[PDB]
A paper describes a structure:
Catalysis by protein tyrosine phosphatases (PTPs) relies on the motion of a flexible protein loop (the [name]-loop) that carries a residue acting as a general acid/base catalyst during the PTP-catalyzed reaction. All PTPs share the conserved signature motif HCX5R(S/T) forming the P-loop, which includes the nucleophilic cysteine and a conserved arginine, which, along with backbone amides, binds substrate and provides transition-state stabilization. Closure of the [name]-loop moves the conserved Asp residue about 9 Å into the position needed for catalysis.
This is in contrast to the typical observation of this loop in the open, noncatalytic position in crystal structures of these and other PTPs lacking a bound oxyanion. For the [name] variant, crystal structures do not provide a clear rationale for how the [name] mutation might affect loop equilibrium. This is consistent with the observation that the T177 side chain is part of a network of noncovalent interactions that are likely responsible for stabilizing the open conformation of the [name]-loop, and therefore substitutions at position 177 would be expected to disrupt this interaction network, causing a population shift toward a closed conformation of the loop. The basic limb of the profile and the maximal turnover number are unaltered, while the acidic limb is shifted somewhat to higher pH, with the net result that the [name] variant below pH 6 is a slower enzyme than native [name].
Author numbering: 1 to 299
Write the structure that this text describes.
């Protein structure tokens, strides 16, 4: 309601850039001293994207507990997310160690391994059933069990095994294939179709650890995904769309990780996705079938 009136106003006055820059100016600034230690330079994909000390995920290793990953703990919405960079060749074991220790059930990947001619993410999961991966540094084994390939995204079932204890867990991998770096999804429908696939899996349940969300830096596409989900959840808990202030929610999220949402068009898209998703939240169940058709997932 109030967010739709605000959307129309911003969009008629052509002021998304100024709205977005105001968010950047008001965003929190907290120290990232661990991320900037010399021994961690090769654990960071981007010099200017670091986790805050207060919200960084710590590995349960005695040597070096550092990974470029942040816990976004949304107190009012009662949902947590782990946002992280795309793993590097030397941090793939750390990534799966974090998944194990945090008891996550789902991993949401919003990028491709190669984008714009460069390698934006290591190949951190196995592409063939018969070629499992072993992470010797963290003593974990990862096997591809099956995969469901749709036209613009893929859902994989992985088996993660702690080789120390021989315990195994099913991890779901939700891989969005058509969301360009620094860009927006092709439509609200295709974004929402994917988001509700993650939701329906149970991966966002409070019974599990936080879902792990990443793109290449873990702030732009990842921030858009989490902002839309949190806004929809807030509206759902209250059953009241007009009670949600997207910009306040984004500023709250930015207390836990810098730079969430990287462009004014990604902010604008977040409004579009939440406004459209509100139709489902407020009881028009049939719109989910509409998104599935408009997303052309079965092509």
């Amino acid at each position: 309601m109030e967010m739709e009136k605000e959307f129309e106003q911003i969009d008629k006055s052509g002021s998304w850039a100024a709205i977005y820059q105001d968010i950047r100016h008001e965003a929190s600034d907290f120290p990232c001293r661990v991320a900037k230690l010399p021994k961690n330079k090769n654990r960071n994909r981007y010099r200017d994207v670091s986790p805050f000390d207060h919200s960084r995920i710590k590995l349960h290793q005695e040597d070096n507990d550092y990974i470029n990953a942040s816990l976004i703990k949304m107190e009012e919405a009662q949902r947590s997310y782990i946002l992280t960079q795309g793993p590097l060749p030397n941090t793939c074991g750390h990534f799966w160690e974090m998944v194990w220790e945090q008891k996550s059930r789902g991993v949401v990947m919003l990028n491709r391994v190669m984008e714009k001619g460069s390698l934006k993410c290591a190949q951190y999961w196995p592409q063939k059933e018969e070629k499992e991966m072993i992470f010797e540094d963290t003593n974990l084994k990862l096997t591809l069990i099956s995969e469901d390939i749709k036209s613009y995204y893929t859902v994989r079932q992985l088996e993660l095994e702690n080789l120390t204890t021989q315990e195994t867990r099913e991890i779901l991998h939700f891989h969005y294939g058509t969301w360009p770096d620094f860009g927006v999804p092709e439509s609200p429908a295709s974004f929402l179709n994917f988001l509700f696939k993650v939701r329906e899996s149970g991966s966002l349940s409070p019974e599990h650890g936080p879902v792990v969300v990443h793109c290449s830096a873990g702030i732009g596409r990842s921030g858009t995904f989490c902002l839309a989900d949190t806004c929809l959840l807030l509206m759902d808990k209250r059953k009241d769309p007009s009670s949600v202030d997207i910009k306040k929610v984004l500023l709250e999220m930015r207390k836990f990780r810098m730079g969430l949402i990287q462009t004014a068009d990604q902010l604008r898209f977040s409004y579009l996705a939440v406004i459209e998703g509100a139709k489902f939240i407020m009881g028009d169940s049939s719109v989910q079938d509409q998104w599935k058709e408009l997303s052309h997932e079965d092509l």
